[PDB]
Amino acid sequence: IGNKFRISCGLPVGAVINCADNSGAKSLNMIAVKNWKGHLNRFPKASVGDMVLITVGRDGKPELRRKVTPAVVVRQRKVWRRKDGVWIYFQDNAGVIINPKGELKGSSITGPVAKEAADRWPKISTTAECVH
Amino acid sequence: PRIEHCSFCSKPVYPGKGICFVRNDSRVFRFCTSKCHRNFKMKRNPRKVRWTKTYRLLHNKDM
Amino acid sequence: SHRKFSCCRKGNLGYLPRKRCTRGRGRCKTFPPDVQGAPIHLTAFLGYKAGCTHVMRFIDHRGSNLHNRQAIDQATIIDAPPMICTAIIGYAKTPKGLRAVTTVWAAHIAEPAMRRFYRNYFHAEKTAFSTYMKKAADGTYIKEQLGRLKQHADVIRIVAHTQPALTPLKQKKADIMEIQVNGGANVAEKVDYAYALMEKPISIKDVFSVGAQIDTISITRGRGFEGVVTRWGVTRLPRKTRRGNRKVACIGAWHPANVQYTVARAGQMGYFHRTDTNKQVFMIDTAENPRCCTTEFDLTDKSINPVGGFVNYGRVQGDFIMIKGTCPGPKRRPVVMRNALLPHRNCPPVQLQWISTASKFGHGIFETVEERRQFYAK
RNA sequence: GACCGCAGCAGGACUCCGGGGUCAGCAGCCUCUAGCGCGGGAGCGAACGCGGCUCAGGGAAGUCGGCAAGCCGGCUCCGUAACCUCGGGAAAAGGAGUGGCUCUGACGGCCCGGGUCAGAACUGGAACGGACGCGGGGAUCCCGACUGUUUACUAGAAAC
RNA sequence: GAAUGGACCAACGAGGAUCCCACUGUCCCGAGCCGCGCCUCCGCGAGCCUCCAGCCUCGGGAACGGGCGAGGGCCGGCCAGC
RNA sequence: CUUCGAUGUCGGCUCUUCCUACCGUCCGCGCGCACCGGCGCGGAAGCGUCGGAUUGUUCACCCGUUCAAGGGAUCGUGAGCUGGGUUUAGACCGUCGUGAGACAGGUUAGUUUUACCCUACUGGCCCCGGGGCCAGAGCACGGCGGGCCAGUACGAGAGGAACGCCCGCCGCGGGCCGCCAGCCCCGCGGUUGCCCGGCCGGGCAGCGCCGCGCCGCCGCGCCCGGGGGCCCUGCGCUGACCGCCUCUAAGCGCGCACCCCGCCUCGCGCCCCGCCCGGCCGCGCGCCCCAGCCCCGUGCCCCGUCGCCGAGCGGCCCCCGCCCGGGGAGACCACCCGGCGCGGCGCUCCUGUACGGCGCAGAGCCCUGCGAUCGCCUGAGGGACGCGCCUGCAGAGCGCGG
């Protein structure tokens, strides 16, 4: 929803990001990023607020694993620069499983969630406890 | 201008300078410099580094 | 066969040949379109890069997420010691192309401009415009020559000299630029306007206005002989490779039997004339004003000078122009600023909430010596 | 330091005597004695090489293959699985401690010796095998039981 | 396919495979920094190669020319790379 | 047909160009095209054609995504690399052979030689003022979404456009360092072994290790990238031959991500001015039009062959230093700047509170002794390559050439 200002992409493909929702998945492996055109040799990259195609890790509930699932990264360890000049980074890299339509697969989003993720996806914004 | 202070150093971060960390406790930790941040990430105590206002408070030099 | 996977060329062939700029300073080359209907205006002005800074801004860009929101941007201060006109050059439009039709020099040429003429002033004989000063002085000769320009010239230019005494650098010899005169109803009016400016100072405030966008021209920062990986952008090859990985692997096919000019080769990177474009003029002011860069929110006098001085540059005593972002060149390098040839249509309006006079030497937290003195007090 | 390889050839030559400190050490790292300053020097501090470091966030997605590098490691103390020819596996895995000072117990001989092992306090930017030395680990599959041996100079193997 | 030995793996192995945890410039995507070469000087100074000559496009030709036919470029003298 | 007194051989990596027999983007046009989407053509080679799992793979295949055409360059690309494939000598296994041995059958282990030459390329040079100008040469923005438009045209509904403008984004390109990461030349603090008798202050362990760190460089950061001309395929206009008809046969308008120019990178040369301002040469002007051709069909015909006066136009020539020292510049040079620099003092910044003195600090031990440490003098001291200044020494060759 809206237009996303470019933010530094800290999570390449092959990254494992934590789950911030009570879906029953603990670790999400980034298979790919939505809306990526490629250049020869360039792995797909992703940042806060970007939909990523993930697969649930073996630690996750059996129903969730063995299938590609869409999710949005909400926390990124790499620091990024907002237009106002704020440089912000998070303690961990985390994601919430969400359908491309925007339905969250989880009742609650635990922990802090980035402002950019919250503006782009409306359901994440209501659910998130804090938008720091 | 609008100003914030380091969560560790306690010196006014000027606008456009500094890094903000969002902790898992949902607390924003604003850091003036990389040094302000590195001391916190090594959990080295704020009250044992003299330049910090926390140690200035403990000495009672600036409180 | 074929490249198999499609990948673009690395580098712009337009910017070849990548040689150190033989021209001394960035040249204006082409000048803005005349228009033929505006208040007569000079189109360019030389500057010395002083430094870069942070500017808090309020954005009025409708349709953008930044609408009604604050922003911080890189600024680039270009020191602008006031220039003085020393001559007027007229150019006929000939079938071959613009060709000069004689120049009329000032009756009195300043020592900085004369210093440019010689390699060593002290050991030279100062024999410049010696018989010219006698031919003029009365000034009847100057008017007669100006009249020849009025009939034989279609493009009028003003020669101008920077005074480097009022600039922190050690150049001492002046820099001469032909600044075009544009917009007047007719050539006779243009040379009349030029005579009024003759032997008198021109300031950036007159040439460029806040909110306009200017094109900055200068020689780039020089890195010396560089490798293909730094110079053209190629990949560092696998780290299991003998004889090095910092080299383009294959420089051509069997046929053509010769290395093509397209292929990336190692050479000089840096010191290249480059023109940047449409950098908005955030603020034109003089450092003499104590409150020159003050804004309502800071409540401090706030002159342009950072605490501790600009880094690799000095006093910036006189007027300055601030441009959005960056201009080509290192600090202490001449940069020709020219009115934009193709300005960006949807540029926001510039309203600066805050400017940073915090020391750029090191990391600064105090924006005035008094402010740092107050903190350290005892 | 003169032998033998065409050389004043980072090549190869058998013995004997072997101090101090840190240490389990004849290890590494500095040193006493004794030797000694090696087919030359100056500048500059490009590319590129050759050795060496560091790198945000991710982490093998790189590659024919995790090649190379990185991790691990000393000591003490817990805690150790399947499997097994019952010997092993096993240092399995997986952890916790470690510095300096100030003490307090143990241990002999007949007031005189050892300096190792425990147990404390107290202190230090949240540090201690602070250099150095010094396994990454697990789950399998195929061959060959094993320690051995092998194409001087492209195969060290499942071959002998 | 059964001492041209079959099946069988405890323990081994600079043996040959597959995967996982860890770890990292292997890579995304490269960047900076040391030393030593390089480079310039002073003094020493070879080897190897060598019909001649050392720019191209096309054509014809032992069918893939520096030289030949037809064009199109080109002062000459050197350096560092490649 | 050429190559065996040898042209290293597959695929990758890397990089560059080329082709169109076009996948999407661009322009028209036809549908068994209402919309959406498909499909077929003609022009079109600017841009994109990616990330990965098995395999040496090319291929093949599958998973993803802005959903992804095919090919040429000695089957482009080994003094570029790799050695995975292959393809010697070691070794098994299966089959075949009495055997030595074979395999168009599998399996493992197996050196990657040399550029200092010449060309080509990439930069650099071969003393000559300041500003400029233009021959030639290079060339660079494209795609993808969102907000409106609008749930509107369109359709019975399901579905579902568009132009325009406005915002982003990805790729690419050229820069830059204010932030924010990275990085440290000799800064400050910690610490291990040894050595300088201890304290202090040092060395050595080829920067012992470590934590920060400025100037600088850098990317992960940031700035920047809005245009004209003729026209293609064709769509139309007046309009015939061929009383009609007709985009065409004259004539005429529109018009492509292509093309060419612009802007941009270079630039031989030339121009103007300065100092000068002096020489050398040559003597020669209507315009248009060809289905009015307005009087045609001539003329010159002698650059020495006697023309060389002058004037007038037009040409042409002639000028224009280094060494040395810094640097924003650098292999060397060149470039840019110059009475520099040295070392002080302020300012600012880096690190983190200097030695020493003091205390009823101090766990305790023991005699006024011992003690790791802690507090005060002290946001101290130490350092600086950034700034401002001279307050001190200095600093502009009758050196060389013109």
- Buried b / exposed e along A61-97 (16+ C-beta atoms within 10 A): eeebeeeebebbbbbbeebbebbebbebbbeebbbbb
- Rounded CA separation C116/C126 (Å): 11
How far apart CA C49 and CA A28 sit, in angstroms, is: 49
Give which of A18, A74, A75, A91 to mutate to test B binding, by max B Cβ within 10 Å: A91
Alpha-carbon span A114 to A89, nearest angstrom:
9
Cα–Cα distance, C78 to C216 (Å, whole number) = 10
- Euclidean distance between CA atoms C205 and C219, whole angstroms: 24
Q: Where would I find the H helices in chain C?
A: 111-117, 130-135, 140-152, 187-197, 204-207, 228-232, 369-376
- What would the two tokens of residue B43 be? 């959990």
Residue window 65-94, chain A: list those with CB within 8 Å of chain B: 75, 79, 85-92
Residue A8 main-chain phi, psi, to 5 deg: -60, 135
Burial of A45 (0-12, 13-18, 19+ CB in 10 A): middle
State the pairing for strand pair C334-339/C44-59.
Answer: antiparallel
Contacts of C297 (CB under 8 A, 6+ apart): B1, B2, C56, C353, C354
Indicate yes or no: CB of B26 within 8 angstroms of CB of A79. Answer: no
Q: Which residues of A touch C70 (CB under 8 A)?
A: 84
Enumerate the residues of chain C whose CB falls inside 8 A of the CB of residue A39: 7
- The partner residue sitting opposite A112, judged by closest CB among B16, B18, B22, is B22
Contact assessment for residue A84 and residue A93, using Cβ atoms and an 8 Å cutoff: no
Torsion of the alpha carbons at A100, A103, A104 and A108, rounded to the nearest 10: 150
**H-state helical runs in A18-121:** 115-120
Q: What is the DSSP string of C329-355?
A: S-TT-EEEEEE-SS--SS-----EEEE
Q: d(Cα C119, Cα C125) in Å, to the nearest integer?
A: 11
Please list the residues that pair with C162 across neighbouring strands. C83
How many angstroms separate the CA of A60 from the C1' of D79? 29
For chain A, helix, strand, coil in percent to 5 are: 10, 35, 55
Residue C253 in tokens: 């096919």
Which residues on neighbouring strands pair with residue C336, listed in sequence order?
C46, C217
Counting beta carbons within 10 angstroms of the beta carbon of residue C45, is it exposed (0 to 12), middle (13 to 18) or buried (19 or more)?
buried
Report how far residue A47's alpha carbon sits from residue A54's, in angstroms, rounded to the nearest whole number: 14
Structure tokens at C290: 């104590």
Q: Which chain B positions have a beta carbon within 8 Å of C363's beta carbon?
A: 17, 32-33
How many CA atoms does the CB half-sphere of C98 hold within 13 Å?
12
CB atoms within 10 A of CB C151: 11
Residue B14 to residue C72, Cβ atoms within 8 A: no
The residue in chain C having the minimum alpha-carbon distance to the alpha carbon of residue A87 is C72
Residue type, C8: C
Give every CB contact of residue C42 below 8 A, 6+ residues apart in sequence.
C158, C179, C180, C181, C182, C197, C202, C206, C207
Choose among C158, C186, C146, C128: nearest CA to C31: C158
Q: Are strands C273-275 and C213-219 parallel, antiparallel or unpaired?
A: antiparallel
CA distances, C280 to each of C28, C30, C291 (Å): 18, 20, 22
Q: Which chains touch B (3 or more CB pairs under 8 A)?
A: A, C
Residue of C nearest to B6 (CA): C365
Q: At what angle do helices C187-197 and C140-152 cross, to 10 degrees?
A: 150
3-state secondary structure of C361: coil
Greatest extent of chain C over all pairs of C-alpha atoms, in Å: 79
CB nearest B14 (choices: C297, C353, C358): C358
CA of C319 to C1' of E56 (A): 57
Contact call for C65 and A84, based on CB within 8 A: no
Which residues of A participate in the annotated binding site? 41
HSE-up (13 A, CA, CB side) for residue C15: 17
Assess contact for C195 and C156: CB atoms under 8 A: no
Question: Please, what's the largest Cα pairwise distance for chain A?
Answer: 44
Which run of H or of E encompasses A127? helix A122-127
Cβ of B3 under 8 Å from any chain A Cβ?
A: no
Tokens representing C83 are 């220039």
| Chain A interface mutation, best of B14, B24, B30, highest count of A Cβ atoms under 10 Å | B24
Dihedral class, residue C129 (left if φ above 0, else alpha if ψ from -120 to 50, else beta): left
Quoted resolution (Å): 3.3
Tokens of A121: 């996806």
Residue C363 contacts B where some CB pair is shorter than 8 Å:
yes
Q: Residue C178: enclosing H or E segment and its boundaries?
A: strand C176-182
Full DSSP string of C196-256: HHBTSEE-HHHH--TT-EEEEEEE----EEE-HHHHH------TT-TT-SSS-S----SSS
CA of B39 to C1' of D31 (A): 40
d(CA C159, CA C197): 11
Is A112 within 8 Å of B26 when comparing Cβ atoms? yes
Helices (H) then strands (E): counts for chain A: 2, 11
Distance, CA of C374 to chain centre:
39
Could you tell me which chain A residue has the CA closest to the CA of C65? A3
Where do we find the tokens 């339509």?
A101
Q: Which H or E element spans position C323?
A: strand C319-324
DSSP symbol at B9: T
Residues 12-31 of B with CB under 8 A from C: 12-17
Q: Please check whether residue A71 is in contact with residue A93, taking contact to mean a CB–CB distance below 8 angstroms.
A: no
- From CA C302, how far away is CA C352, in angstroms rounded? 14
- Mode of pairing for the β-strands spanning C176-182 and C155-162: antiparallel
Distance from CA of A64 to the nearest CA of C (A): 36
Beta-carbon count within 10 A of C365 CB: 21
User: For residue A132, what are its two tokens?
Assistant: 């720091």
Give the Cα separation of C355 and C375 in Å (integer): 21
Calculate the alpha carbon distances from C293 to A62, C56, C290, C305 in Å. 63, 12, 8, 9
The whole-angstrom separation of Cα A132 and Cα A111 is: 10
Cβ proximity of C346 and C277 under 8 Å: no
Burial C24-38 (b: 16+ CB within 10 A, else e): ebbebeebbebeeee
CA gap C354, C293 in Å, rounded: 9
Sign of CA dihedral C183, C185, C190, C192: negative
Is B14 part of the contact surface with chain A (CB cutoff 8 Å)? Answer: no
Q: Which residues of A touch C72 (CB under 8 A)?
A: 83-85
What gap in Å lies between CA C237 and CA C246, rounded to an integer?
Answer: 7
Cα(B18)–Cα(B2) distance, integer angstroms: 14
What number of other Cβ atoms are within 10 A of residue C93's Cβ?
A: 11
Give the nearest nucleotide to C230, CA to C1'. Answer: E30
Q: Which chains touch C (3 or more CB pairs under 8 A)?
A: A, B
The one-letter amino acid code at C67 reads H
- Structure determined by: cryo-EM
As a whole number of angstroms, the distance between CA B53 and CA C8 comes to 55
Biggest distance spanned by C-alpha atoms of chain B: 34
SS3 C318: coil
- Tell me which residue of C349, C104, C330, C329 sits closest to C213, measured CA to CA: C349
